[PDB]
């Protein structure tokens, strides 16, 4: 009943937090595509940076999932 209302609304608020994450990561991704156009020859650097840059953009989204799972399952 009452307590679970708090928990449930917390899960929703956590899902709302992900609206930002997808936006930020999207920014990163789009720069890669634009860069390929200018210098296909520098794909070596681009590919390496893809991993590093993408990882950072992901991490905070993962931490939010953990928090959502905590609110949902104790």
């Amino acid at each position: 009943n009452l307590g679970q209302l708090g928990q449930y609304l917390g899960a929703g608020l956590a899902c709302v937090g992900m609206a930002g994450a997808a936006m930020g990561v999207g920014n990163v991704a789009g720069n890669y595509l634009a860069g390929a156009l200018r210098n296909p020859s520098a794909a070596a650097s681009q590919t390496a940076t893809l991993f590093i840059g993408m990882a950072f953009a992901e991490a905070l989204g993962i931490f939010s999932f953990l928090v959502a799972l905590l609110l949902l399952f104790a």
Binding site: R38, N39, P40, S41, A42
Partner: protein, 42 residues
């Protein structure tokens, strides 16, 4: 030449433009009339 040397200083890379680097045509300028010694021979 001044403006051209400025643009080439900041000309992105690779990929630039074909006219600044391709990745033989011989043009020869001579007179129409002679009587100019070895001008055309040289």
């Amino acid at each position: 030449a001044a403006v051209m040397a400025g643009l080439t200083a900041a000309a992105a890379g690779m990929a630039p433009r074909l006219l600044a680097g391709t990745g033989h045509l011989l043009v020869v300028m001579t007179s129409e009339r002679g009587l100019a010694g070895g001008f055309n021979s040289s």
